[PDB]
Amino acid sequence: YRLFRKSNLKPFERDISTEIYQAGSTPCNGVEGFNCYFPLQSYGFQPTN
Amino acid sequence: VYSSANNCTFEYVSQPFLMKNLREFVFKNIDGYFKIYSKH
């Protein structure tokens, strides 16, 4: 699932990208850790869930 | 124009053909739907 992307999209529209969103405090354009974050996050789907 | 494309999602091919005038169109992309008008 898209980790985070700005605000509400319009109905029936997708979100595929590798844009490293700087949702955190600084406008970092790195990879992860703080600020600069990957736009997508994966679910922890296990049979134990 | 035909260039290095990528993971293509939609693809429709019309029937092949071989080819003073007006040709007026309309493009409408509303709620994810692309609408085309025409007149000759």
Side-chain angles (χ1 to χ4, degrees):
Chain A
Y1 83 97
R2 180 122 273 180
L3 194 32
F4 42 70
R5 201 270 313 135
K6 280 281 157 305
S7 64
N8 216 349
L9 44 72
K10 294 312 201 43
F12 292 163
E13 143 189 274
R14 225 157 276 116
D15 252 10
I16 312 109
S17 96
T18 51
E19 190 275 302
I20 307 304
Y21 193 174
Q22 56 283 63
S25 68
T26 82
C28 175
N29 289 271
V31 294
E32 261 295 329
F34 195 33
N35 324 288
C36 38
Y37 291 130
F38 201 82
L40 305 174
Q41 178 149 287
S42 53
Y43 306 61
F45 286 147
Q46 286 161 358
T48 191
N49 298 6
Chain B
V1 54
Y2 159 58
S3 198
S4 77
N6 204 36
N7 227 357
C8 298
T9 48
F10 188 89
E11 188 162 40
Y12 153 66
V13 177
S14 91
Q15 293 210 318
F17 30 63
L18 196 52
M19 320 185 257
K20 306 302 197 81
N21 309 269
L22 75 91
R23 219 179 49 138
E24 312 205 71
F25 313 148
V26 155
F27 322 134
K28 295 210 283 193
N29 188 57
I30 300 301
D31 290 344
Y33 298 111
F34 203 84
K35 325 168 189 290
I36 296 97
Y37 294 78
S38 56
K39 182 51 178 276
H40 182 211

